[PDB]
């Protein structure tokens, strides 16, 4: 109808929900929930299930992609009712799906609602492809996308608008694994940080301040000359005492986010700059797809948001690749590649943002599955969800 | 859709189908000889010629479905004794026939028909029920 | 990766398993008068920031090797310097904390045996011990001020902390 | 580019009608017992690459997220894995949906694993169903039939999923568009499959003095073998 | 959650992050969100021309011409008052909250703006309440099309106000579930003899509306509603209204929520089952 | 006793007149050989030359040749070469699939059953070098079950989907001549109906001939047993059992009979010819100190059968058909028989034999 | 119980007449391997269809020949809600059928649910506790379905009361 559709992009930690044709995804809240330990009615989720002390918090989207379906259905219940508010038999939907989503896993999503609220029809969208949201605002459905959220990095690239069950590898780098470092190096610094509100500070420090530095041993003197031109003090609040304590947040600001290019730098837990990993991936892909996989560099997701981040990567990825291509004109000669980063805008929590404008559209209404069609063959007829966005 | 409609696989000289071979208790032959004080033997009569010498549901729906009765208008505390009064070549035959009533519940045209079967074991053997499976010229 | 040495000229006679470059010091320098605005000592100061954090250095030049000794020496300036009341107090330590004959390449007490090897002789060695010494003294006084602050009793409430992390994890002190 | 090899043969690393195709187009088999007769050259523009390809597209519609080229070889090996041919498609097709005892798992190379539906008797059926790949070819049967009925009218009697199937094609077209009668029982026809190779008659004594030696292979001018 | 949300939370956290800028010294940035709601209604906050220092949230309701005169186009403002301003093309009711014109510490507004529907419906209720809570018999019933096809009817009898049920559910069997609820809904008043009643009638509407027009059919169902004096009085002309219309969304939800729980059972009697299956081989 | 092997069930298999080696197939496409050494068996020269499943296996006693064969045709012996068996290419002229094989006392010809409406009786051709094969042709049009040889190395029989068994006279001129006669059929024209069957309802999973030519038994699938005495006026007896349907049988004496199967346990049979009718009375099983010990209840994976799965084969050992003493059965799961025929005669209540 | 056991009692053994089997190579065709009972391509391969009903509301068909065994059953559709419930239950079972190499995605003719026991099942699996799946299922299913009426009727009530005290 003349009514816009609902779109949901969940994820391991935080959950993203909303409508259709909006600048931000209405609300984003933690997915935990719980009942005691007739009973399905009593349950809370989001900025509520994290405080409940009588209910026990569990997290359904672990090990990356979607998990426990039973527990998930209760969540979806509150997402619709008491939040977005929509009579589901009247609204088209959208439930993201981490790559690798086997048919079996897809069937679980297609069902439930269709067999519960019999909502009209729903598309299950792929993360990386959606991760080409606003990057079009700064055209193509071929490129190499880094979505890296909080539990680990992700080298999810493109492929004509589909998944590449092969060309992708993960690196144990995560927003939190940055945090361990910032907080760790801070421990040896100024004292006064309660162990209990320690995590608090790490999550906060990473957000409120941190940034990327072009060169390492570069500013590391400017930052000792003009110490009073960047060195600030965090205004944290105590817990049991509730006393306010200020510390001088300094090097960790730019000396921490640097754990991206040298993951091995904080703790040894990894052996390769991220840019380099990307190279392994791109050159390992079929040539007739390696070229385009260089002019399209996108970020997006809860860990890619950092000042001067986007700039430093193109250069770093480019110098190594240029160096490799040098070792080839020694046979004379080839066409020098050409990388490039992309920092559109809604990089914070994209994906939702993308899909939604492009699902606010009639096209979504073409490839989307109809209710009557669901009661025909069943739910299986949803395992494959055709792409739509270029010529269409 | 055209030549794939025809099915010759059913005309292959080498395909194989059983030799179609083709009478039964007389609706009253033993009936009378039952009505008296004989609820322990006479009912065995229902054996004279088994539906196997001719086809058609007609004979199987009557001369063959005649034995459905007897056991129906029975009691219970007297079933086993009848069964042991049989041998290898007279016990299983009652099982195959048991299955006919079990195929046509017809609500009343069946009722129970589980007792004689439960007690059918102990003497016929777990094979009795299985033996029925391997039977070309069934009831 | 990390940062190595920039100055390596053929004049630097390959001494033992290192270089032998000179530096700008006011005390016992067995190497000529560096005419640059940035000598070995300066190279270390402008670095070490990502040294300890880095775990995969590549020996490019023997100057890198000298730089490496000095970077490692910086560590002593904390076991017995980090906890020193006022800078005018940790100065005397430089003598003892510097003169204290350290396990030169070759010793039953010295780590980093890899690229390191003492000259298996008694001429290059005893003589090598004299370069290996001015650092223990010049690299210290020429380092206390830059690391510290014009303030007293404040070994830079930011540097006097890097005491818990060491380059490549190799205890040059114990 | 070829002659760089064809040496690995000595010192370098040494001392009627049937059927045969793989991926580089199909081919039919005109051979008047012994030598082939170009008099009957027909070919289908659909082969292994096309079978892997319809299979790739089919697998994607199953629920598995797969991009070709890179994985063409994995899926290719999948082709010669268990892709058998169905005998009577109405029955075999209804036995894949009504039941699930056709389902097999294959440990891929990405340690992901993915169960497989009944496409095995659906995907390779690219012959009998040319339309699956847009191609206007005609399918093993229409093809086989049209081939014998062409000249050699006299004396005509004379992927583990197809040897048995071939027997059905004895009738598919013989009875409906030719002998519409029902006493066809006669005219017996049999299909085998020795699945060896062509490596035969290459040590025959019937070739040990019938295959031109080297005292007469060029003696009478480099042209003593331009016939046959 | 058992009853249902009527305070429209999809307005409170959003609106707050506009108001809070003048609580420490922060500039007021703009914003653009166009969500919806149930029954069809769907608010939508937007700036005027481009004024970032001025927020305004409205509403689009289909059935407006019909429920207009129904006091709706009379009172309404009686709640918001001067905060309530000139409407918008394509929509209706307009409420205007100024980040500049801030009457301090009075959250008693959000709850007043959130449930914009309640205030509007309230009229159609207060109008019929007088013909029962004040007297005057021989009147006329209201007309409600929250949907193109489902409808709620009112009754201005002597001393009692009851709502007419009609609404329709798709899935043949989902219709069937409602029968359990309608059972355990009218024939089980354990709350209090003061609890309004709720008759029933499927495939046919009670005589209290059999001779009028109304969609009719085998998959269609009608219902009844009551409103004792104690419920229709002024002293309660809010508590009753507080959670009344919620019935519509109250039925669908609950009627649908059971179908989630029922699924869960179909998992235990299966989680346990699959294990049984694996418990058959020479070894697990 | 009792002894298993692996989860998967072994189809067929043959024993060697040396009680040392033994070829088996685990639902795979390659036989397996093992060797003894203090009760410690170990994989021996894995024989793999079968695409799909593998059924047919038989071991020619005093000649030491193994003959494999499975569905997808298959046909290549592995005879000891140096010390590493080898495979051989041999196609049995089908277009369907083969099921079971038995050599013969004379060890010059093997027989591989089948269900493609044929039995197939190939034979080695010394005058032609390469191997060959014959054909019994009609009357057959169904799955062909196993086929045992008669203490004659000529006349044989076997059951199939035809319900009733059937006996043929395998004669080869290009190798042998007029084998001497038997009461079954004085005429030996290579494949002649010698004897039929009376079960015209009952299938036939297994057959075995008496070490002398007068006792022939064959089981179906309907939990029936059959027995025909050629010397007893070719009379056909019959008697059904109470338990399920067995799968395997052999003549433990020149007039004895025993076998088990899907029940997972052995039962014993004898026979009084002078009655013309079947006789049963077995059911063997177990649910200078040694000559007494290894018993005990327990003092109060969980079957009351020796075996944990239905049986299939059951080849004897010392005195195969004339006077058994040590026979073996191989069931689907672990369940593989291990017992001294006498370490049973010396036990249970009533035991006949003969 | 009067008799919700004797029915189950004849059944609790009736199946033990087809179980035992082996992988069966294809006759008519070749190297395909399938369920003859589900194809009947070999007419000779059939055990006569049989059915052991208890009355008429709870029927149970049984078939088989070799590597193929059929076993259909009609769920006790006791009331309106059970009528609706059972297909909607059988469906959950049918959708994950691929994981239960025993249940058919669609039930056979007219019946509500169908099984399938093949040679593959009686091999990597026994037969005794495997057969017992049926008792543990017909009886277990009855409790789940029968309890539904109470789960819905009792569950519905809370929604009505928690909506009256507030008026």
């Amino acid at each position: 109808g003349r009514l816009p559709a609902c779109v949901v992009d969940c994820g391991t930690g935080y959950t993203k929900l909303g409508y259709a044709g909006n600048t931000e995804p209405q609300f984003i809240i933690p997915s935990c929930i719980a009942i005691k330990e007739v009973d399905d009615l009593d349950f809370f989720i989001g900025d509520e299930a994290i405080e409940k002390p009588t209910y026990a918090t569990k997290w359904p989207i672990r090990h990356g992609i979607v998990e426990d379906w039973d527990l998930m259905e209760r969540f979806m219940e509150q997402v619709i009712f008491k939040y977005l508010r929509a009579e589901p038999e009247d609204h088209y939907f959208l439930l993201t799906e981490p790559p690798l989503n086997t048919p079996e896993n897809r069937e679980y999503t297609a069902e439930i609602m269709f067999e519960s609220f019999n909502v009209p029809g729903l598309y299950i969208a792929v993360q990386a492809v959606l991760a080409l949201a606003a990057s079009w605002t700064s055209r193509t459905l071929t490129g190499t996308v880094i979505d890296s959220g909080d539990g680990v990095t992700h080298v999810i690239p493109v492929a004509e608008g589909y998944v590449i069950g092969s060309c992708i590898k993960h690196i144990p780098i995560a927003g939190r694994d940055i945090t361990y470092f910032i907080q760790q190096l801070l421990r040896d610094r100024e004292v006064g940080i309660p162990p209990e509100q320690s995590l608090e500070t790490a999550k906060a420090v990473k957000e409120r301040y941190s940034y990327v530095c072009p060169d390492l041993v570069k500013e590391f003197n400017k930052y000792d000359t003009d110490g009073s031109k960047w060195i600030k003090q965090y205004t944290g609040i105590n817990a049991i005492s509730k006393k306010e304590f200020s510390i001088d947040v300094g090097y960790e600001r730019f000396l921490g986010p640097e754990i991206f290019f040298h993951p091995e730098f904080a703790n040894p837990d990894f052996t390769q700059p991220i840019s380099e990993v990307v190279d392994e991936v791109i050159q390992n892909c079929p040539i007739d797809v390696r070229r385009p996989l260089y002019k399209n560099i996108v970020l997006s997701g809860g860990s890619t948001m950092f000042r001067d981040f986007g700039r430093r990567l193109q250069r770093d990825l480019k110098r190594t690749v240029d160096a490799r291509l040098k070792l080839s004109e020694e046979l004379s000669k080839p066409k020098p590649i050409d990388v490039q980063v992309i920092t559109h805008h809604m990089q914070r929590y994209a994906v939702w943002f993308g899909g939604s404008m492009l699902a606010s559209t009639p096209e979504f209404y073409q490839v989307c599955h109809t209710k009557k069609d669901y009661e025909e063959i069943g739910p299986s007829i949803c395992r494959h969800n055709p792409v739509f966005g270029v010529m269409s | 859709a055209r030549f794939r409609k025809v099915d010759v696989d059913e005309y292959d000289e080498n395909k194989f189908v059983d030799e179609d071979d083709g009478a039964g208790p007389d609706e009253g032959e033993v009936d009378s000889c039952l009505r008296q004080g004989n609820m322990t033997a006479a009912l065995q009569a229902a054996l004279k010629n088994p539906p196997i010498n001719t086809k058609s549901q007609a004979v199987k729906d009557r001369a063959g479905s005649i034995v459905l009765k007897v056991l129906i208008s029975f009691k219970a505390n007297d079933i086993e004794k009848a069964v042991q009064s049989l041998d290898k070549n007279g016990v299983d035959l009652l099982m195959k026939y048991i299955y006919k009533g079990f195929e046509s519940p017809s609500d009343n045209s069946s009722a129970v028909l589980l007792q004689w079967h439960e007690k059918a074991l102990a003497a016929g053997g777990v094979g009795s029920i299985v033996r029925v499976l391997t039977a070309r010229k069934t009831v | 990766p990390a940062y190595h040495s920039s100055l390596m000229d053929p004049d630097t006679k390959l001494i033992g398993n290192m270089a032998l470059l000179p530096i700008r010091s006011q005390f016992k320098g067995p190497a000529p008068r560096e005419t640059k605005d940035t000598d070995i000592v300066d190279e270390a100061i402008y670095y070490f920031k990502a040294n300890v954090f880095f775990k995969n250095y590549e020996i490019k030049n023997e100057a890198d090797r000298t730089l490496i000794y000095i970077t490692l020496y910086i560590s002593e300036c904390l076991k017995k310097l980090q906890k020193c009341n006022s800078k005018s107090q940790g100065e005397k330590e430089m003598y003892t904390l510097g003169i204290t004959n350290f396990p030169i390449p070759g010793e039953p007490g010295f780590p980093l045996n890899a690229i390191y090897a003492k000259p298996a002789n008694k001429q290059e060695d005893e003589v090598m011990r004299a370069y290996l010494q001015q650092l223990r003294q010049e690299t210290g006084l020429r380092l206390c001020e830059k690391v510290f602050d014009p303030q007293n009793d404040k070994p830079s409430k930011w540097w006097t902390c890097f005491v818990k992390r060491q380059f490549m994890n190799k205890s040059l002190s114990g | 580019r070829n002659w760089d090899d064809m040496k690995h043969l000595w010192d370098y690393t040494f001392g009627g009608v049937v059927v045969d195709s793989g991926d580089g187009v199909t081919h039919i088999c005109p051979v008047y017992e012994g030598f082939s007769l170009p008099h009957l050259t027909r070919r289908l523009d659909i082969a292994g690459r096309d079978i892997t390809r319809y299979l790739i597209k089919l697998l994607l519609l199953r629920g598995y997220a797969f991009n070709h080229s890179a994985d063409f070889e994995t899926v290719r090996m999948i082709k010669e894995k268990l892709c058998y041919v169905g005998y009577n498609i109405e029955q075999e097709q209804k036995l894949a949906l009504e039941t699930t005892v056709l389902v097999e798992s294959y440990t891929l190379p990405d340690g992901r694993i993915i169960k497989v539906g009944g496409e095995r008797f659906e995907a390779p059926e690219a012959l009998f169903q040319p339309h699956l790949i847009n191609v206007e070819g005609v399918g093993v049967a229409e093809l086989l039939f049209n081939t014998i009925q062409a000249a050699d009218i006299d004396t005509r009697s004379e992927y583990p999923g197809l040897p048995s199937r071939l027997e059905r094609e004895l009738k598919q077209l013989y009875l409906e568009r030719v002998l519409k009668g029902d006493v066809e029982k006669l005219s017996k026809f049999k299909i085998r499959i020795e699945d060896p190779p062509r490596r035969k008659h290459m040590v025959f004594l019937g070739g040990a003095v019938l295959a031109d030696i080297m005292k007469d292979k060029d003696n009478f001018w480099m042209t003593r073998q331009e016939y046959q | 959650m058992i009853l249902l949300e009527v305070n429209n939370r999809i307005i409170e956290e959003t609106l707050a992050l506009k108001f809070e800028n003048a609580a420490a010294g922060n500039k007021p940035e703009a914003v653009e969100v166009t969500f919806a709601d149930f029954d069809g209604v769907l608010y939508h906050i937007s700036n005027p021309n481009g004024d970032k220092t001025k927020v305004m949230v409205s509403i689009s309701l289909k059935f407006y011409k019909e429920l207009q005169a129904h006091g709706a186009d009379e009172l309404l403002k009686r709640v918001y008052g001067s905060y309530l301003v000139n409407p918008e093309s394509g929509y209706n009711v307009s409420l205007l909250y100024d980040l500049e014109n801030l009457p301090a510490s009075k959250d008693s507004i959000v709850h007043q703006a959130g449930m914009l529907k309640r205030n509007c419906f309230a009229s159609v209720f207060e109008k019929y309440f007088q013909f029962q809570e004040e007297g005057k018999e021989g009147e006329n019933r209201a007309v409600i099309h929250y949907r193109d096809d489902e409808t709620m009817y009112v009754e201005s009898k002597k001393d009692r106000v009851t709502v007419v049920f009609s609404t329709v559910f798709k899935d043949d069997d989902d219709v069937v579930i409602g029968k359990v609820f309608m059972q355990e809904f009218k024939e089980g008043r354990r709350a209090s003899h003061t609890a309004p009643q709720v008759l029933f009638s499927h495939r046919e509407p009670p005589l209290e509306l059999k001779d009028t027009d109304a969609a009719v059919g085998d998959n269609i169902g009608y219902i009844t509603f009551v409103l004792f004096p104690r419920h229709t009085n002024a002293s309660a002309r809010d508590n009753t209204i507080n959670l009344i219309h919620t019935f519509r969304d109250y039925l669908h939800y609950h009627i649908k929520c059971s179908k989630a729980y029922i699924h869960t059972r179909m998992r235990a009697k299966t989680s346990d089952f699959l294990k049984v299956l694996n418990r058959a081989r020479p070894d697990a | 006793a009792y002894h298993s092997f692996l989860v998967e069930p072994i189809s067929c298999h043959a024993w060697n007149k040396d009680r040392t080696q033994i070829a088996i197939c685990p639902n795979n496409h390659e036989v397996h050989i093992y060797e003894k050494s203090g009760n410690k068996w170990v994989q021996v020269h894995e024989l793999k030359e079968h695409n799909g499943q593998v059924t047919g296996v038989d071991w020619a006693p005093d000649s030491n040749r193994i003959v494999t064969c499975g569905t997808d045709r298959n046909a290549y012996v592995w005879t000891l070469k140096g010390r590493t068996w080898k495979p051989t290419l041999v196609i049995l002229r089908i277009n369907r699939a083969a099921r079971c094989v038995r050599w013969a006392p004379n060890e010059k010809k093997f027989a591989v059953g089948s269900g493609s409406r044929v039995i197939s009786i190939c034979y080695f051709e010394q005058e032609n070098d390469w191997w060959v094969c014959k054909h019994i042709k009609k009357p057959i049009r169904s799955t062909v079950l196993s086929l045992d040889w008669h203490p004659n190395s000529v006349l044989l029989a076997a059951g199939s989907c035809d319900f009733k068994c059937r006996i043929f006279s395998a004669y080869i001129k290009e190798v042998e001549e007029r084998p001497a006669p038997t009461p079954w059929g004085s005429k030996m024209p290579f494949g002649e109906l010698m004897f039929e069957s009376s079960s015209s309802c009952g299938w036939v999973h297994g057959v075995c001939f008496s070490a002398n030519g007068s006792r022939v038994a064959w089981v179906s699938h309907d939990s029936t047993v059959c027995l025909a005495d050629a010397d007893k006026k070719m009379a056909v007896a019959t008697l059904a059992s109470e338990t399920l349907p067995l799968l395997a049988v052999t003549f433990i004496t020149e007039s004895s009979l025993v076998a088990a199967g899907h029940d997972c346990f052995p039962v014993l049979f004898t026979y009084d010819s002078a009655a013309g009718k079947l006789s049963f009375g077995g059911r063997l099983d177990v649910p200078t100190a040694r000559e007494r010990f290894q018993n005990l209840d327990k003092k109060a994976a969980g079957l009351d059968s020796l075996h944990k799965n239905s049986v299939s084969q059951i080849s004897v050992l010392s005195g195969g058909k004339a006077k058994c003493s040590q026979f073996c059965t191989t069931g689907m799961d672990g369940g593989m028989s291990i017992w001294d025929v006498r370490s049973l005669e010396s036990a249970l209540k009533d035991l006949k034999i003969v | 119980t009067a008799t919700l056991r004797p029915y189950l009692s004849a059944v609790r053994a009736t199946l033990q007449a087809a179980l035992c089997l082996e992988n069966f190579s294809s006759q008519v065709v070749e190297r395909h391997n399938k369920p003859e009972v589900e194809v009947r391509s070999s007419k000779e391969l059939l055990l006569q269809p049989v059915t052991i009903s208890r009355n008429e509301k709870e029927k149970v068909l049984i078939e088989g020949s070799i590597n193929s065994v059929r076993v259909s059953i009609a769920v006790k559709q006791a009331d309106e809600i059970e009528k609706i419930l059972c297909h909607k239950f059988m469906r959950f079972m049918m959708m994950r059928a691929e994981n239960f190499f025993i249940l058919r995605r669609k039930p056979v003719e007219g019946y509500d649910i169908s099984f399938l026991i093949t040679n593959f099942h009686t091999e990597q699996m026994y037969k005794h506790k495997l057969v017992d799946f049926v008792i543990h299922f017909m009886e277990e299913i009855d409790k789940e379905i029968s309890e539904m009426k109470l789960s819905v009727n009792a569950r519905a009530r809370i929604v009505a009361e928690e909506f009256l005290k507030n008026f």
Side-chain angles (χ1 to χ4, degrees), chain A residues 181 184-185 188-190 215-218 220-221 224 231 248-252 255 262 264-266 268 271, chain C residues 1-3 45-56 149 157-165 169:
Chain A
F181 187 44
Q184 270 193 35
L185 208 174
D188 325 344
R189 202 240 328 302
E190 66 213 324
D215 207 88
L216 280 176
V217 303
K218 188 200 183 168
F220 272 111
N221 194 292
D224 291 289
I231 302 305
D248 296 301
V249 172
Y251 308 16
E252 59 271 345
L255 194 33
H262 295 331
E264 70 186 89
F265 222 76
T271 329
Chain C
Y3 294 85
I45 303 192
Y46 193 59
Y47 302 144
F48 176 91
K49 270 321 284 177
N51 259 61
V52 66
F53 283 161
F54 205 75
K55 250 134 193 184
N56 253 334
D149 273 58
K157 75 145 169 181
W158 285 96
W159 281 26
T160 181
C161 303
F162 305 151
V163 76
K164 148 146 179 114
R165 308 215 160 257
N169 280 332

Side-chain angles (χ1 to χ4, degrees), chain E residues 138-157:
Chain E
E139 304 295 340
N140 293 288
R141 66 185 60 180
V143 175
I144 311 181
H145 300 41
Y146 60 91
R147 284 288 156 83
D148 284 340
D149 57 319
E150 299 135 72
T151 55
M152 263 185 262
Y153 303 84
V154 295
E155 258 180 79
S156 174
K157 237 130 240 323

